[PDB]
Write a protein that holds these residues in place. Structure first.
Motif, mmCIF file in Angstrom:
data_model
loop_
_atom_site.group_PDB
_atom_site.id
_atom_site.type_symbol
_atom_site.label_atom_id
_atom_site.label_comp_id
_atom_site.label_asym_id
_atom_site.label_seq_id
_atom_site.Cartn_x
_atom_site.Cartn_y
_atom_site.Cartn_z
ATOM 1 N N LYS A 121 5.810 6.751 -0.251
ATOM 2 C CA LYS A 121 6.652 5.590 0.045
ATOM 3 C C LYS A 121 5.731 4.409 -0.009
ATOM 4 C CE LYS A 121 10.082 7.692 3.127
ATOM 5 N NZ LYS A 121 9.481 8.810 3.865
ATOM 6 N N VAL A 122 6.301 3.220 0.160
ATOM 7 C CA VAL A 122 5.602 1.977 0.004
ATOM 8 C C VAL A 122 5.599 1.211 1.334
ATOM 9 C CG1 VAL A 122 6.068 -0.295 -1.085
ATOM 10 C CG2 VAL A 122 6.201 1.722 -2.503
ATOM 11 N N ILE A 123 4.424 0.719 1.736
ATOM 12 C CA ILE A 123 4.398 -0.064 2.963
ATOM 13 C C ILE A 123 4.097 -1.491 2.478
ATOM 14 C CG2 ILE A 123 3.093 -0.488 5.110
ATOM 15 C CD1 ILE A 123 2.271 2.575 4.962
ATOM 16 N N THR A 141 0.872 -1.206 0.000
ATOM 17 C CA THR A 141 0.000 0.000 0.000
ATOM 18 C C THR A 141 0.894 1.236 0.000
ATOM 19 O OG1 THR A 141 -1.994 0.993 0.894
ATOM 20 C CG2 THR A 141 -0.418 0.123 2.488
ATOM 21 N N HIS A 142 0.418 2.436 -0.376
ATOM 22 C CA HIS A 142 1.350 3.565 -0.477
ATOM 23 C C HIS A 142 0.902 4.672 0.485
ATOM 24 C CE1 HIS A 142 1.830 1.260 -4.095
ATOM 25 N NE2 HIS A 142 3.023 1.816 -4.231
ATOM 26 N N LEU A 143 1.871 5.401 1.009
ATOM 27 C CA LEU A 143 1.621 6.579 1.872
ATOM 28 C C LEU A 143 2.814 7.438 1.813
ATOM 29 C CD1 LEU A 143 -0.867 7.166 3.744
ATOM 30 C CD2 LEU A 143 0.545 6.464 5.674
ATOM 31 N N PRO A 201 11.415 2.269 -0.065
ATOM 32 C CA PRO A 201 11.144 3.466 -0.916
ATOM 33 C C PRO A 201 10.365 3.062 -2.193
ATOM 34 C CG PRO A 201 13.514 3.014 -0.761
ATOM 35 C CD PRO A 201 12.831 1.958 0.090
ATOM 36 N N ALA A 202 10.546 1.796 -2.621
ATOM 37 C CA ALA A 202 9.836 1.215 -3.802
ATOM 38 C C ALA A 202 9.717 -0.290 -3.699
ATOM 39 C CB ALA A 202 10.647 1.530 -5.138
ATOM 40 N N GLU A 203 8.707 -0.909 -4.330
ATOM 41 C CA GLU A 203 8.506 -2.384 -4.210
ATOM 42 C C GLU A 203 9.220 -3.247 -5.281
ATOM 43 O OE1 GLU A 203 4.992 -4.575 -5.280
ATOM 44 O OE2 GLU A 203 4.999 -5.494 -3.200
ATOM 45 N N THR A 204 10.455 -3.604 -5.022
ATOM 46 C CA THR A 204 11.294 -4.307 -5.951
ATOM 47 C C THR A 204 11.313 -5.769 -5.554
ATOM 48 O OG1 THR A 204 13.403 -4.157 -4.659
ATOM 49 C CG2 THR A 204 12.873 -2.342 -6.312
HETATM 50 CL CL LIG Z 1 6.732 0.944 -6.113
#
Ligand SMILES: [Cl-]
Ligand SMILES: [Cl-]
Lengths: 149, 8, 149, 8
Positions: C15-17, C10-12, C34-37
């Motif tokens: 940033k990415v949680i 989810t994003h806030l 910081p991103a979903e890799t």
């Molecule tokens: Cl992302």
């Protein structure tokens, strides 16, 4: 005793590995940080207390015991912050042989991982799943579930 | 580089 | 069922949680990245699987299902990597309302923390301790203990 | 700065 954890800080590769041990089971959580600070210790304890029912933490040294930031996280998360004096001298030995065990494991995986943080999490996984037979991860769930019941 | 966390 | 987890991203605050939910209890673990890799997802699952007995993970999207790095961590940690297709349509709504609940909690704590990662861990703590009666943290320990016995 | 993670 279901709620009691001990902090422990060990070093490898110029970095710090902070470990929380659940004393009754030997189950551990750990992370790599560049240096031990009250801020890094406090955030680790907040993480641990959201994942297990942490009632008391025996701090690893007098700086983390004194740190107002660590005391603030123990207040936030409902943890009784205590010293880590080995009144039972068996504690010193147990912690030392745990750090030697983890470092042994880390060496056995070390070349599967680019970063030390990966190796330390592989070592957490192996330690917690090792049957010695129940594993530490089985013992902690049994202990806490018995407490809830 | 042939590692779990860096397959390259 | 004791071993089944679902990933959720989810994003806030730009940033990415990343969240992992234990499906049968609703217990969660989460981190800010910081991103979903694939590398971040892979490390997160290695951490989760060293802490709980993770048998299957339903991935949060097709990039993480395809990712060879994520499959490499699931192989390492002995996890069955599966897709997250909501064959039971109840899943979409449950995940959406968990994200809304966590963002609500995060807003309620947000001014107590300088960094978002602190607020997310306070939100994990509140979520897992909330009694709805038992908490999710009590439910996950009961489920896995029943399975071990 | 008056926060849990930054007491200042
Ligand atoms: Cl992302
Ligand atoms: Cl240090």
């Amino acid at each position: 005793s279901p709620g009691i954890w001990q902090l422990d800080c060990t070093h490898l590769e110029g970095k710090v590995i902070l470990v929380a041990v659940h004393v009754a089971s030997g189950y551990i959580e750990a992370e790599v940080i560049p240096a031990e600070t009250g801020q890094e210790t406090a955030y680790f304890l907040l993480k641990l207390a959201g994942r297990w029912p942490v009632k008391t933490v025996h701090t690893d040294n007098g700086s983390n015991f004194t740190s107002t930031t660590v005391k603030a996280a123990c207040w936030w998360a409902g943890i009784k912050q205590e010293d880590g004096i080995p009144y039972n001298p068996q504690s010193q030995g147990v912690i030392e042989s745990m750090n030697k065990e983890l470092k042994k494991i880390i060496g056995q995986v070390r070349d599967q991982a680019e970063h030390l943080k990966t190796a330390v999490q592989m070592a957490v996984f192996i330690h917690n799943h090792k049957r010695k037979g129940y594993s530490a991860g089985e013992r902690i769930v049994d202990i806490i579930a018995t407490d809830i019941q | 580089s042939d590692k779990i966390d860096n397959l390259d």
